[PDB]
């Protein structure tokens, strides 16, 4: 399955889709934190990734079609599509498609929207490695950072860089097993999950976000490197239909009461 219900509602009511890379207990607030704070009765499904390994061979069209065909099969109408971070790219594509497949277009709301670059990929890699430095061990972590830095210096395209960082991280997992005493099945889960993440980010980067965000309402944190914040003010205004701003960190955006209050009004 490609979607999971995360909030319940009237049997045939309009549905909200929420697109993000699920990682329960991650530090950044998630869609579950937002939906907790929305209007009762808002039915919400969150995007699931392909089962681990089955993403290999999938490009952005295949990601989007998998999500879309499940919605088509369900018979449900979509009232809004939400995305967070790179999920915003998929959220955009799906909303554009649903505008064409439905009599009435869904609302599109994007939260710190990003189209991944080599920079955002490399930062995410360093964060993943740092967060796992305990389980990888000091040797494997250090070497992953060194190799990753080399890679980010040499490889200028998103798809190539992502492939090499997955190679690096896979190697680090193996090294943590051979040294560091990491359990082999847990290492395979860690490396397959980072691989799934990079596949998702690289596919998100392929989406024509300039086309797919033209109708979006953006919700922006105050973190200057996140979302639309690094853009020139005229570039931001050109890119999306409307931008709401909130004085919160990127990591707390989806758990903010203010944000939720505003989203409920956007969806009403």
Provide the 3-class DSSP secondary structure of residue 50.
coil
- Burial, 58: exposed, middle or buried (Cβ in 10 Å; 0-12, 13-18, 19+)? middle
Among 259, 7, 232, 3, CA closest to 112? 259
Dist. CA 228–CA 109, nearest whole Å: 13
Question: 86: closest CA among 220, 214, 203, 189?
Answer: 203
Backbone angles phi, psi at 267, to 5 degrees: -95, -10
DSSP class of 208? -
- 219's tokens: 């919700």
Task: Give resolution, Å, one decimal.
Answer: 1.6
What six digits make up the tokens of 89?
A: 């790219």
Total count of residues recorded for the chain: 268
Phi-psi region of 82 (alpha: psi -120 to 50; beta: other; left: phi over 0): beta
Across the strands, what pairs with 7? 44
- The C-alpha atoms of residue 31 and residue 28 are separated, in whole angstroms, by 10
Identify the three-state secondary structure at position 263.
Answer: helix
CA 201 → CA 15, 26, 41, 178, 267, distances in Å?
A: 25, 17, 31, 29, 27
Strand partners, 4: 46
Rounded to whole angstroms, how far apart are CA atoms 268 and 264? 6
From the CB of residue 190, how many other CB atoms can be counted at a distance below 10 Å? 21
Tell me the DSSP string of 153-194: HH--SHHHHHHHHHHHHHHHHHHHHHSTT--HHHHHHHHHHH
Experimentally determined by? X-ray
Q: Give the Cα separation of 147 and 151 in Å (integer).
A: 6
What burial class does residue 96 get, using C-beta atoms within 10 Å of its C-beta: 0-12 exposed, 13-18 middle, 19+ buried? buried
Strand 15-19 and strand 78-84: pairing?
Answer: parallel
Question: How far apart are the two ends of the chain, measured CA to CA in Å?
Answer: 28
């Amino acid at each position: 399955r490609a979607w999971r219900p995360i909030a319940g509602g009237p049997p045939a009511g309009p549905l909200v889709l929420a697109v993000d890379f699920a990682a329960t207990g991650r530090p950044e607030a998630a869609f579950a934190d937002l939906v907790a704070r929305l209007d009762p009765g808002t039915e919400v499904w969150e995007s699931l990734q392909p089962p681990l390994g089955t993403e290999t061979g999938m490009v952005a069209e295949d990601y989007v079609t998998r999500w879309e065909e499940e919605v088509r099969a369900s018979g449900r109408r979509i009232g809004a599509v939400l995305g967070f971070c790179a999920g915003s790219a998929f959220a955009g594509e799906l909303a554009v498609r649903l505008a064409r497949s439905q009599p009435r277009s869904p609302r599109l709301v994007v939260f710190d929207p990003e189209s991944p670059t080599t920079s955002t990929l490399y930062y995410q890699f360093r964060k993943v490695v740092e967060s796992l430095a305990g389980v990888l061990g000091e040797q494997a972590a250090r070497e992953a950072l060194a190799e990753g830095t080399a890679a980010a210096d040499r490889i200028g395209d998103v798809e190539g860089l992502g492939a090499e960082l997955v190679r690096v991280f896979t190697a680090a997992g193996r090294a943590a097993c051979a040294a560091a005493d990491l359990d082999d099945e847990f290492a395979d889960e860690l490396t397959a999950t980072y691989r799934s993440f990079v596949s998702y980010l690289v596919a998100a980067a392929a989406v024509d976000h300039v086309k797919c965000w033209s109708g979006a309402v953006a919700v922006s944190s105050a973190t200057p490197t996140s979302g639309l914040n690094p853009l020139d003010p005229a570039a931001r205004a050109a890119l999306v239909e409307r931008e709401l701003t909130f004085d919160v960190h990127h990591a707390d955006l989806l758990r903010d009461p203010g944000v939720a209050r505003a989203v409920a009004r956007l969806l009403a």
